């Protein structure tokens, strides 16, 4: 509290910014690919099923 060495609030704000940045890059993947399941990383079962089909 009121300390020089540490600022927890900046850490929480930074992890929140990292979360919104990850959501942004995921949406960028959904537009540049046009697919909501573009790879096995998104969902392996539906992806393998659509691949075989």
């Amino acid at each position: 509290l009121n300390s020089i060495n540490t600022n927890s609030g900046a850490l929480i704000a930074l992890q929140n910014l990292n979360s919104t940045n990850a959501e942004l890059t995921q949406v960028q993947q959904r537009i540049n690919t046009g697919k909501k399941i573009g790879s096995a990383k998104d969902n392996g079962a539906i992806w393998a099923t659509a691949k075989n089909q």
């Binding site: 940045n21 890059t25 960028q28 537009i31 540049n32 046009g34």
Partner: protein, 53 residues
């Protein structure tokens, strides 16, 4: 008649169905424009941290 049948078979082997190709052309032009938009949005990501200094 046999020569006409052989030419028809060569056409069945190689010829493309352009009616599918027109829809593919339209969808691919739209997908390319969306991909250029997503690429620009990905290129802009670095700018945000200049304002926090």
């Amino acid at each position: 008649k046999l020569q006409d049948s052989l030419d028809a078979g060569v056409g069945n082997l190689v010829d493309a169905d352009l009616a599918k190709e027109s829809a593919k052309l339209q969808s691919l032009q739209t997908k390319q424009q969306l991909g250029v938009q997503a690429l620009s949005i990905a290129n802009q990501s670095s700018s945000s941290i200049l304002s926090l200094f």
